[PDB]
Amino acid sequence: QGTILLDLAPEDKEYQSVEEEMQSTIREHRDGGNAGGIFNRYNVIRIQKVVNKKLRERFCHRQKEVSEENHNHHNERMLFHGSPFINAIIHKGFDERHAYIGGMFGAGIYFAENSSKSNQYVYGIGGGTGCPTHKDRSCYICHRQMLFCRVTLGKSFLQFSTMKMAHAPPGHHSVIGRPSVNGLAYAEYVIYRGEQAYPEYLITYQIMKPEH
Template identity: 35%
Template sequence: MASVLCQNGCGRDCGKGADGRVFPTCCKSCAYLKKERGLCGHDIDCDIRANEAVCPPWYWKSAAVWPEPFHEEVGGEYVKEMGTKILQRRLPDWKVVRCERIEDAVLWDKYTAKRAQLRERSVAKANIQPETAESIQYSANTTLDHRVNEVWLLHGTSEEAAKAISHSNFLPSSGGCFGSGIYFADDARKSNQYASRTAEDQKIMLLCRVALGGVKVLPEGQDRSADRFAADPSIDSILGTTDAKEFVVYDSAQIYPEYIMYYQEIGTA
C-alpha cells in the first residue's frame, strides 16, 4: 500500500493506529500547530518515525536550515514569559528580563545521538515529574522523549560560563553534595544560589534539556561519593535530595543548554 501524506502539507507520512487505521495527519501536534499558528510542527513520536528525532525542535528558527551548520541565539517575548513563569514558582519577586534560546547544530547533533543511544537501550522509565514541567507549554512538552526520561532542568551560573556552555557544553564539577558531575535542579531557589550577577545587576540561569536515562534515586541526604555509580552502565544520572532535588549527570552529551535566562528582582529592572 502506498504511503499517504499528512494533509497539513508537512511532507511526512500520515500516522497509523495500532489497528492499522490511517489518520489524516502525521501527529496531533502537526494538526494543532497548523490550526493555531499556521505552521508545521511535530511531537517526539512523529520525529522518531521520520528521522530518529535528530531534526531540531519545530519552534527553532534554525530548523529551516537544518542539517546545515548553525549557531543562533534567539530572543523574544515568548521565551521571556516562559522563563518568568518557571522562576516565579519559587522566586515570586524575580522576573526574566531577557531570555535567549540557543540553537546550535553541533551540540544538537551530539545530544540527539546520545538520546537515540539511550532510547535503543530501553532505559527504565523513572517516576520523576520535575517542577519545571508544570511551566512549559503543552506543545513544547510534546518534544520531550519521556522514554529516556528527558526533562527540562535549571542550572545557575555566570554570564561568561553560560556563553561558553552555549558553544561547547558543560564540564563536570570536581565535587559537590553527590560527588563529581554536572548538577541541575528543578527548583529555581536552588539554582539561584549558584547564579552570578552581571555588570547590569542581573543574574544568570540556564534552562536545559537533560536526557536523564537510567536514574539512580538516592536516600535523602548527601552522598559525596555518589559518582561511584557512574561506573554502572545501567545508570546515567542520579537524583539526590538535600534542601531540594539535585539531578547529576556524568556525560555532557546528555545535556542540551537550550535557554539562557537573565533575571532580576522586580522593582530593580
C-alpha cells in the same frame, strides 16, 4: 557553525511559558537568603533560545544510546542550571571535565526544578562572594544568567548524598539526590556526561527587592 542566540518576544507563548516556570518555582530556603539573595520575584530582562546544530546532534545521539538502555525511555526533563560558567556552556555545551568531587558535590553537573535553587549557584558554591562588581550575594543591580535546559535522565539512581560519585551507577544514567530530614530540602539532578543536557534557554534577569 557556532551558537546563535535568538531573542523571544515577551508576547511569544514560549517566552511566557519559560518565565512563568521560573517565577513560580521560587521557594524559600533555610538560607536567610544568604546564598541567593532576598527576593520573592525576578525581573526577567531577557530570554534567548540557544541554537547550535552540532550540540543538538551530540545531544540527540546520546539520547538514543540512553533510550536503548532504558527500554526506549530517555526520560527527558526541563530543568534549571545556575553557575558562573553559563557563557562557556552556551558556546561549547556542557562539559563534565569541569566538574569535581568535593564538598557535598560529586564530579557531575547539577540541575534543579526550582529556579531559586539554581540562583543560589550563579555566583558560586553558596553564592560565593556575590556579584563581581559589588561582591553582594543579594545584588539587585547586576544581571544574572541561568539556563532552562533539556536533560536526558534515562534511568535515575535515587540517593540521599551526591558527594563521592564520579559516574552514574552501573545500568544508570543519572543520579537523584533526594530530600532527607538531615540533608537536602529539594531534589538535586545530576548527570556525568555533558551531552546529556542541552541548554535550550538563556535567561537574563535580576532578583527584585521585596516591595514595601
